[PDB]
């Protein structure tokens, strides 16, 4: 649209994004418009509320309300560069230092925004996220998340390296840890896994201790019920898909025979 051009600020790209997104947060706090809105014909945006499947649960302990942004049709990923623009709009739309031309009320913190990326980027980014930091009602900052994902025959990681890596990167002296493990109990609805989390972590691949917090995650029918539905559908459409009978005696014989028995006292 005006995005990427001189008319971007002029024609309010960010503000129109922030407004669109504010519709849904305000909308879904009631109506659940089972349609991910087309922001840019090729780009769609869903909100994730309630207890619906959250794609971020695969990689994060938090199960918050969240927008997911993706390429219009598994789900498809936008190029990293494009995702970064969208993360940009969302950031600016909430920035107090940014001149506003349409919006004339204080901006509300919106649900975090997350965007599916295709890697194809030196550092192989598969997700970009943005989350607001609010002091009271007043905003203040955003957290910008990068997610990368590698598949290999090997892997190397060190609990100390990650501890420091976090310390160096965010200038901190202490640091704590939270652990999570998932166990697939049953596959094939029909999928059951056990989620376990504890604090603190003292070992990579540590076996969750028994003081961990835990949950069970749960994601030819018999003939009588099947017959029930057959009757129900027939009644609805006028086309009854009768089942093969189980009995050699016909319906009438079985019934007459039933009746005979009840007359004999």
């Amino acid at each position: 649209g005006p995005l990427g051009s001189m008319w971007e600020r002029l024609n309010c790209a960010a503000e129109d994004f922030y407004s669109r997104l504010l519709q849904k947060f305000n909308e879904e706090k009631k109506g659940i418009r089972k349609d991910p809105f087309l922001y840019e014909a090729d780009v769609q945006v869903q909100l994730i509320s309630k207890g619906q499947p959250n794609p971020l649960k695969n990689i994060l302990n938090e199960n918050d309300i969240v927008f997911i942004v993706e390429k219009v049709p598994g789900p498809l990923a936008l190029p990293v560069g494009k995702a970064r623009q969208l993360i940009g709009l969302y950031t600016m739309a909430h920035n107090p230092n940014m001149t506003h031309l349409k919006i004339n009320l204080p901006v509300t913190a919106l649900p975090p925004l997350w965007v599916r990326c295709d890697s194809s980027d030196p550092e192989g980014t598969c997700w970009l996220g943005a989350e607001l930091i609010t002091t009271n009602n007043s905003i203040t900052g955003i957290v910008l998340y990068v997610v990368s994902c590698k598949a290999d025959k090997n892997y190397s990681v060190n609990l100390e390296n990650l501890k420091n890596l976090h310390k160096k990167r965010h200038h901190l002296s202490t640091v704590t840890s939270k652990g999570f493990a998932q166990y697939e109990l049953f596959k094939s609805q029909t999928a059951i896994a056990l989620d376990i989390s504890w604090s603190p972590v003292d070992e990579i691949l540590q076996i969750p201790p028994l003081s961990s917090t835990a949950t069970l995650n749960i994601k030819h029918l018999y003939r009588e019920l099947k017959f029930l539905l057959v009757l129900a559908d027939g009644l609805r459409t006028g086309v009854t898909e009768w089942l093969e009978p189980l009995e050699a005696k016909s319906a009438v014989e079985l019934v007459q025979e039933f009746l005979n028995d009840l007359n004999k006292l």
């Binding site: 789900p75 997700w127 609805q189 029930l228 009978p245 319906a251």
Partner: protein
């Protein structure tokens, strides 16, 4: 071995018989014709479990205490009739499972049991009850002899299905004590292992995770381990 409901009344035995044999509309007309005539002739005195709003039960009460309506088994009435008999009998099967196992009270189930709603809605609600049993059956091997786990699961399922349609993708979460589930994980290799490092600022984090399959559904990859990381940047305004 769960206890089968065998105390079946006339209407219920009828349902069982007809449900294994009926292969056409005319089957229904002929079967119901024989029963109605058997009733008008007064040749039988059948017993019914109390509290059924089926046309057949009505027509039976009228046969015992008085005399019956001229039914006319035309249009969709013979279908309707068998459908009613099936619904009662199946609702009573489910009630007896859930009450009997102490997974729910009659009160809890009222929504699924409802007489007032239309016949397709009643059927649809029987399917919800069934889908609840399927969930339970799926978990039984894992929450073996944990009646409270079985109980809560049944409760959260009931809560969900009063408010929601059958077709939605949904993850049920059942809090479980690690002891109650020890054997299922302690010697097991996890499908994912995740460490998250943060400090007071709980939003600010570094996350490392190992998985035995892709934790990213859109990732196109064109024994393998999957590794992924989550890092962030603070930006102040």
């Amino acid at each position: 071995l769960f206890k089968v409901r065998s105390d079946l009344d006339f209407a219920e035995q009828l349902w069982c018989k007809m449900s294994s044999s009926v292969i056409s509309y005319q089957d229904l007309v002929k079967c119901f014709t024989l029963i109605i005539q058997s009733l008008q002739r007064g040749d039988i005195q059948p017993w019914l479990h109390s509290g059924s709003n089926s046309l057949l039960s009505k027509l039976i009460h009228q046969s015992y205490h008085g005399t019956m309506d001229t039914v006319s088994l035309s249009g969709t009435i013979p279908v309707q009739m068998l459908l009613e008999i099936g619904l009662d009998k199946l609702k009573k099967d489910y009630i007896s499972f859930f009450i009997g196992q102490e997974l729910a009270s009659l009160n809890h189930l009222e929504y699924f049991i409802a007489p007032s709603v239309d016949i397709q809605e009643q059927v649809y609600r029987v399917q919800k009850l069934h889908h609840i049993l399927e969930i339970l059956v799926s978990c039984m091997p894992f929450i073996k002899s944990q009646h409270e786990l079985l109980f809560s699961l049944t409760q959260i399922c009931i809560k969900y299905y009063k408010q929601n349609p059958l077709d939605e993708q949904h993850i049920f979460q059942l809090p479980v004590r690690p002891t109650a589930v020890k054997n299922l994980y302690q010697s097991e290799k996890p499908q994912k292992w995740r460490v998250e490092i943060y400090s007071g600022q709980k939003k600010i984090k570094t996350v490392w995770q190992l998985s035995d399959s892709s934790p990213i559904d859109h990732l196109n990859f064109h024994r393998i381990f999957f590794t992924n990381m989550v890092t962030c940047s603070q930006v102040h305004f």
